[PDB]
Amino acid sequence: YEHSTVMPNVVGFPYKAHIERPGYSPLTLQMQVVETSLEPTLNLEYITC
Amino acid sequence: RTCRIHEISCGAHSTQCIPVSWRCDGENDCDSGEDEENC
């Protein structure tokens, strides 16, 4: 079964997704982000001291 | 007890007549599972 949701990008927020699929009882899926990283790619120009 | 010949009784404190075909048919047809005892 395919499902798509959108969860906010905030650390610690408890997000809950509801899946309703015919023939079955609904499912609640909880999923939250515990940390995030964001690394740029770096080109070294020079070194100074 | 003392139900119709075509059926039995499956309780002592409580009365519950079940057909003889339900006696030892592989399923618990009574509140107390004494249909599937000592088959």
Binding site: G23 | Q16, S21
Partner: protein, 49 residues
């Protein structure tokens, strides 16, 4: 044969698939416990039992 009166048929699940993908429940009141034979009077639905 046990006597049945006030029969109501309500459908729990319904998916028009290849197997038995539909469920219906029957509410009734009977005088005595026994065995009854179910049937469906249209070819639009096929009963498993």
């Amino acid at each position: 044969a046990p006597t049945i009166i006030d029969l109501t048929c309500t459908v729990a699940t319904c998916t028009h698939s290849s197997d038995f993908g539909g469920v219906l429940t029957l509410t009734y009141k009977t005088d005595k416990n026994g065995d009854c034979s179910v049937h469906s009077h249209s070819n639009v639905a096929t009963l498993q039992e």
